[PDB]
Amino acid sequence: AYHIDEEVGFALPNPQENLPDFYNDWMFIAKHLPDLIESGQLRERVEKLNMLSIDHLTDHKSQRLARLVLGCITMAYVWGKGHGDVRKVLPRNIAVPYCQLSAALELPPILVYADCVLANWKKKDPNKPLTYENMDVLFSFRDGDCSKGFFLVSLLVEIAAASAIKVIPTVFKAMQMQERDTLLKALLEIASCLEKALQVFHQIHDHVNPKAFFSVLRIYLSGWKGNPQLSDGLVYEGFWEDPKEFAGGSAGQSSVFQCFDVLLGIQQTAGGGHAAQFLQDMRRYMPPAHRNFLCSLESNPSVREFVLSKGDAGLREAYDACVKALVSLRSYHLQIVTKYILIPASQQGGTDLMNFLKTVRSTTEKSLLK
Ligand code: HEM
Ligand SMILES: N[C@@H](CC(=O)c1ccccc1NC=O)C(=O)O
DSSP states (O other), X not given: OOXXXXXXXXXXXXXXXXXXXXXXXXXXXHHTHHHHHHTTOHHHHHHTOOOOOSTTOOSHHHHHHHHHHHHHHXXXXXXXTSSSOOOOEEOHHHHHHHHHHHHHHXXXXXXXXXXXXXXXXXXXXXXXXXXXXXXXXXXXXXXXXXXXXXXXXXXXXXHHHHHHHXXXXXXXXXXXXXXXXXXXXXXXXXXXXHHHHHXXXXXXXXXXOHHHIIIIIHHXXXXXXXXXXXXXXXXXXXXXXXXXXXXXXXXXGOSHHHHHHHHTTOTTXXXXXXXXXXXXHHGGGSOHHHHHHHHHHHHSOOHHHHHHTTOOHHHHHHHHHHXXXXXXXXXXXXXXXXXXXXXXXXXXXXXXXXXXXXXXXXXXXXXXXX
């Protein structure tokens, strides 16, 4: 209804793995980035490409796949080996069809979370369920970059939150119909589903190691919105005349935390800059059906006001359980950022990044009712 799945939520159900034979030249380069980058040939291959019309991408999953391919080539081309030797101009034969496909999908021409997590996965055996050991990513950047661990655990955290988003309708039917036990059961189910997502987030440490992420994988996830290396943005040759700035693909582009902010009345959604607006800016990097889900959610009556006006220590307790699960997620997430960003940057905090994350948690903490 809003491109949300029952089993995988904001994730794309069974992504396409193949593009039509017309696009083999893209697929070949995208599937061999680790070789081509290491050998210092990637840029030469990109420049030798021909302009390939997007006209033969006629279904959504194949356009999704084509954006993942083009997004990964774009990251590799711009940054190269990550040795500070950057390219400031995306060649015309890639930039035009990429920008055209991105306009059709209503996404910025940069690699986003919906590309490299939500659409970048396959089941090893389809008859066996969605667990790490039975899944693989579709593209990677450098050997030992831990893209498989980072992407798949993100996805598995995404899939765990999915089992909460399917209760969200029932929360609202229950409020409407003055249905006290249902609403209390429903909020409990959400809190327990947010709790299972926190368990799943623990799998990060045995599939990603801090140095691979911080010094290899992070390079190719970096964008050009306020980045000293491309002080002015990127030139999408033959599509726009002046450079453009787009944010690098943080997992901050996930809709999961915002979905439950909006549902719980937590005013991250609104507020003061350097915080509420970064979360608003980050909405522009999410698929359009998902942008709409978040907006429709706000239009709904407040759950926090409903629960507040009922003198019901039961409803207040279940609502607080959901608030408390959210606070744990961001707290654990603060741990994750320390190990995978701060200590490695510290070994050759110092960035307000932590004040952003901490601010967001404190807001979540101050929404507790009782
Ligand atoms: C595993 C290593 C991870 C690192 C190093 C990391 C890093 C970051 C950073 C740096 C930000 C702030 C945005 C920015 O400045 O780029 C952020 C925010 C965020 N991250 Fe991640 N992240 C990781 C994993 C995850 C995972 C698995 C999720 C699962 C949903 C997630 C969800 C979010 C969300 C929702 C935000 C927005 C801030 C908020 O709503 O609290 N992150 N993260
Ligand atoms: N080490 C440099 C150059 C480089 O890595 C590179 C990688 C793939 C294809 C071409 C490259 N540079 C010049 O042709 C860099 O950081 O981009």
